[PDB]
Amino acid sequence: ATCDLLSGTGVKHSACAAHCLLRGNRGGYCNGRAICVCRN
Secondary structure (H helix, E strand, O other): EOOOOOOOOOOOOOOHHHHHOOOOOEEEOOOOEEEEEEEO
8 A cells, every 4th residue: 555645635644554444454554665564
């Protein structure tokens, strides 16, 4: 997934973690290339 706020909202990069949480994952973190890496 991405950590970008390309979609407008999600300016707070915590949005990546939330995007993962919305799939039932434990959450996620952002890589320095704006890639979002979900946990299991």
